[PDB]
A paper describes a structure:
We therefore measured Pi release rates for the mutants F54Y, P42Q, E49G, and the double mutant P42Q/E49G of PfActI. In the Ca condition, the F54Y mutant behaves similarly to P42Q, whereas the rates in the Mg and MgK conditions were most similar to the E49G mutant. However, whereas P42Q and E49G directly affect the tip of the D loop in the filament, F54Y presents no foreseeable structural changes besides the added H bonds to Lys62 of monomer n and to Tyr170 of monomer n − 2 in the filament. Additionally, the effects of the F54Y mutation on overall rates (but not the activation) show that this mutation has a role beyond post-translational modifications.
Actin is the constituent protein of microfilaments with essential roles in central processes in the cell, including transport, cell division, and motility. Here, we analyze phosphate release rates and high-resolution structures of wild-type and mutant Plasmodium actins in different nucleotide states, bridging the gap between structure and function in understanding the polymerization mechanism and the instability of the parasite microfilaments.
Author numbering:
A (entry chain G): 3 to 52, 55 to 125
B (entry chain A): 5 to 41, 52 to 366
Write the structure that this text describes.
Amino acid sequence: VEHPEFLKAGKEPGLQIWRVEKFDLVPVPPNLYGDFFTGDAYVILKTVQLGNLQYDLHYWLGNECSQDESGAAAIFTVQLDDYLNGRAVQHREVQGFESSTFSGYFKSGLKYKKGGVASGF
Amino acid sequence: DVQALVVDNGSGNVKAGVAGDDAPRSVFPSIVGRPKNDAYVGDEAQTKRGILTLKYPIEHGIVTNWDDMEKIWHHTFYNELRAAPEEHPVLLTEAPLNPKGNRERMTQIMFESFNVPAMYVAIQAVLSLYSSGRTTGIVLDSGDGVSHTVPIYEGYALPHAIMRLDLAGRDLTEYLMKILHERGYGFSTSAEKEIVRDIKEKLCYIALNFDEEMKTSEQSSDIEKSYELPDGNIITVGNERFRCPEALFQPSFLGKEAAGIHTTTFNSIKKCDVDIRKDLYGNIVLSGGTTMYEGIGERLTRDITTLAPSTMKIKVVAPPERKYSVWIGGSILSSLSTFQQMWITKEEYDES
Ligand SMILES: Nc1ncnc2c1ncn2[C@@H]1O[C@H](COP(=O)(O)OP(=O)(O)OP(=O)(O)O)[C@@H](O)[C@H]1O
Ligand SMILES: [Ca+2]
Ligand SMILES: [Ca+2]
Ligand SMILES: [Ca+2]
Ligand SMILES: [Cl-]
């Protein structure tokens, strides 16, 4: 199972963030990295160069995101991991209770915004 | 450009609808009636019970009467959805531990009787976990005919740790029918059973501590709640309100030697290697109609906390729409941009 964004996932060390929008995985504009809409759900892939690459997948759930968004973020996380031959470690991140590892990806720290993209439901 | 149909077939009810809806638009009883001397399905079969022999094609979550199951599926497509099955992808669900031969029979019927163009078979408990926004956890799915505990890690069920309990909602309805004899009620006929099922859903609840609830309920009449029967007569139910679902925890009430749902969940977690148990204990997700009793989360939390190592963090999750969480998970999955790559096409199937 592929997808244009799967084809881009985990190719180089770095940080990739997608937002669930209407049952699809849409890149977040890099200027917005670290800011998260409370109305939305997101998938985050951190790739680290060891010789090989190490992968951590986090799915972040805003307190007001809709069920289609959190459900899709979970499913897309599984599918990305499968595309990465199962080698990613998956992490569920809830707004305001995120792991220190996840917070550590953002030099400015994690911040939240009101609003979000419309539910697919 | 085509929308998938989502069909979740249960022992008691079928849930059906279209991908992208937040709830099934069709829910009807999983019953097929044929003349006592060609077949009717669902609500219409019950309105004609006097003329028909009624059968349940799904037993404890497993399809076991294939001829009648085909009638259920025909009714789903033609009478409920009014959809041409040969023109839509279909997502169908199956029970945990469903034998591969049964899945193969389900697939043959879809591709060769209904000519579906593409289909995907999903495990019910996995869909429910996804509908809760999780990839790891243990699902307790209790329906009308079967209860399962299903540990799931990073998206996939762990088959060696799944438990099946044949105790579920229909046993509870029957137990309520039995204990109401203490009060002089003689509910026994199929139609009376559907009334008692409604009494159970409306009035029952799970006690936080059963022995203490028996004691407090005996001290006054506050326990008693009324219910209006179809004939207009009123029935009063007392401690039966919590004694009935107590059988989920104490199956001996039903004459079954089985372990209760708390013990079963614990045993299912213990089958998983120690390094993943914390994530299971912290993500116990309830699913299915028989998990809808008021009080269930608090009671399970106490009981599993008692059984589990005291270093664990027990969290029981009770999603409000969990009666339909399987179907909802299927609706989300079949809506994703990637679903097209997950299904099997009729051409692929027909060429082997
Ligand atoms: N509010 C409620 N309180 C208690 N029980 C309920 C409630 N609502 C529904 N039920 C019970 O849930 C059962 C149906 O649940 P569900 O639809 O999940 O089962 P199914 O999918 O038909 O069966 P299975 O999963 O066992 O094959 C019935 O026994 C019904 O009485
Ligand atoms: Ca949103
Ligand atoms: Ca993995
Ligand atoms: Ca079910
Ligand atoms: Cl303990």
